[PDB]
Symmetry: D2
Subunit: 248 residues, 4 copies
């Protein structure tokens, strides 16, 4: 298919991979809702992108906020066809460090799980109901949901336990959610990015091309997933063939 006329809700849409996705899709004729925190810069980004883009302030961990954002999307554009989960946070903290006597805090683990994993699920479960209102297309499809994991789901480095747990959870739930939503024609896919230039040594680690990924390359893969009706239930690494070393 083509993305012209589709309505996309993009979490984390004020910055980075989410913003690059919004820019590409709006440039291809889609409408976009940037779902991001208050004072994320989302309003100014939506204004810059023109009248087919609006900002919906929301914390993905809040049922009430996501409900409000989806009602805003419905009032503005009439339907939701695509959801892209880019909202996320990171921490670097070792499980335990004997030399320094330091133990990872429980709260640092919980915070990253809540935003990255529970937040993605919260958006999925609520947007599925919105997509379920669509009449199926000629191929039976009502929507497409795309999540963002990380190569840390597969080769987490020293200090990445919390982040890797959160992203490994995204990977683990991709297939069951695709199976849950198959009877109503919503595809569910995940991208696992490597190292991307969002907000020299890191670049040199990538086999080829030997640079950070361009956010537009993430946006290109999102578009390819929306366009290809047979991509479902899968995780795609987008990473220049990197495999992460253990680090320190």
């Amino acid at each position: 298919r083509s993305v012209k006329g589709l309505v996309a809700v993009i979490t984390g849409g004020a910055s980075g991979l989410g913003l690059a996705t919004a820019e590409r899709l709006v440039g291809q004729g889609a409408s976009a809702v940037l779902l991001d925190l208050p004072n994320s810069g989302g309003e100014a980004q939506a204004k810059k992108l023109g009248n087919n883009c609006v900002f919906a302030p929301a914390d993905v961990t809040s049922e009430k906020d996501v409900q409000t954002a989806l009602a805003l999307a419905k009032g503005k554009f009439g339907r939701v066809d695509v959801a892209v989960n880019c909202a996320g946070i990171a921490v670097a903290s070792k499980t335990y460090n004997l030399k320094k006597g330091q133990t990872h805090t429980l709260e640092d683990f919980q915070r990253v799980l809540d935003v990255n994993l529970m937040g993605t699920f919260n958006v999925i479960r609520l947007v599925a109901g919105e997509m379920g209102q669509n009449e199926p297309d000629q191929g039976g499809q009502r929507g497409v949901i795309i999540n963002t994991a990380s190569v840390a789901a597969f080769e987490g480095q020293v200090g990445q336990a919390a982040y890797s747990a959160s992203k490994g959870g995204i990977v683990g739930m991709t297939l069951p959610i695709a199976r849950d939503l198959a009877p109503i024609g919503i595809r569910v896919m995940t991208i696992a990015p490597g190292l991307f230039g969002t907000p020299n040594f890191l670049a040199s680690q990538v086999p080829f091309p030997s640079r950070l990924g361009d956010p537009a390359e993430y946006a290109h893969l999102v578009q390819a997933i929306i366009e290809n009706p047979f991509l479902n239930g899968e995780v795609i690494r987008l990473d220049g063939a990197i495999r992460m070393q253990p680090g320190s």
Copy 2:
């Protein structure tokens, strides 16, 4: 090595796979601490297992409770050599069901993540500090940590999104935690069981042997991991070659 004289803390040790693990290890001359909820039956199980087994009441989601349980283990047996994470819960709930108009609750997702994933991490981070007090053995080893994932981490069924997210998180953090703890000689391994006869159609789904797994077979694999010094950073499926169908 042999397990005789080792001290194991076994979460979920009052029932099922954890109890089978305690029974085997105590039978092989190890000491065991059954870490499980109040009114789980843990006290009666510890009494039945004899004077090298004690019950430590604790909720794995509580820092205070796990701290208390580990201090109990230290006071009783002097050290901790092995931790086995079996504490866990389940739910069956579809992400969204159009026919019935039902959406998975946020709380059902959060509850399963908290016990299965955050609870395992809470035990890991605190037991690592305890193991760090041990003098390394002749091969540099201070401890062994074994987690329980599930084949649902890889092929979650309809209704298993929350459970699969939790277990996929266990899988995802295995390698980074092994990397974090490598400098101090604590190995970190995960078992992904298939279908086990803990608390006819399900049995017929297993290729060979065509039955539910015996909890003693999980306990045997735990012992094999403790005994083999070169198993680290890996997930082992224990499942009779099953691959789960989507279900309904």
Copy 3:
């Protein structure tokens, strides 16, 4: 935005198995999008008729992928006709259905059936890779330092092979296994290496099969394989990876 090739227009692709099925669909899409295609397929295939239908930007190169001499001949033909080769797509393949051992019948999988499937599917793919890599290595790099991109065809059988699929699954698991080391070998000279693992597609290789796919519940359309090929060529950051294209299917044992 980092300088790179983000278009198939003007590129030249050598497509093994190009006379039929997934390879033919790929040739059709790429020629329609402004690329040139060389259909590398067996002399007894319909490749010549297919290349004529596709017009002046498509030619047939007869070759058995298991032969060093034949692949060399095909690549020299490609260079003579179109010059620079930018893309290689490995679709040449065969299948067998044969149980390892069947006690009821007292029947053992033949060694020759295993060898033949390995030779065409795995060794033939490597033969094409090693020779096209040498050709691509002579290319002046593009604006993003790239000299080529190579796309292989595995199968979901590499991950969930069914009863009777031992030989086919071995061959496609080999494809999966070598994707990363070959991407690593060729990274210093700017050749990306990627693999697609299709599920069940409506080619001459293939209702009950359609019903096992979660969504959409049908056989894949060869045009959808071709679309993913084009997406890989146009995305400069996809390298060293296997992508399942399968409607979320996970194969049960079968019989």
Copy 4:
């Protein structure tokens, strides 16, 4: 507790590659634990001397795993000596280090090097499987319905192959790929099929290598491979799976 075989004592194992390295370590452990071992290895190996050292419960069966006739001869020798075969362990294997293409040197991987590694490592393992499965199929089932267990040797190169490892990684990825379909083929007759993927072990196949392993930071001891073999034989519920035995290593590209 479900009735099953949970001991190696009294079992007979055919071990390919048994004259050296991981296969020899496996034979040593199993014979010490009360099993009988047949070392299936090349006629120009030291298998006879090794079998003599191991005593009356170990014999040498000369054979090239790539030959149907040789493997048939070895299995008939096993049956003549010990009767029933309960276990097969595939350790026979070779390696090559050769880049797909090297632009600086103008050097291309030879087709014959790829073919030879595939033939020994992948086709040879299948040849042994298909023939020993037929032998095991004649066995009266044990107390848990089992007629055999087959254990193969892959490598972590199946998942993270390095520069120069394309051929080896293809062969070991094939082993990984066929593990599940063969387990599915043989499930109705009670033969389990499992694979071990070793990291880096101190055999005649092999300080800097030791330093890459997270913990323990050393080469694996062949005795640790043997211990995992015994654990798989003794655990009735391990089937259709690949187990990494590797100290948590994940291989970087190398050069």
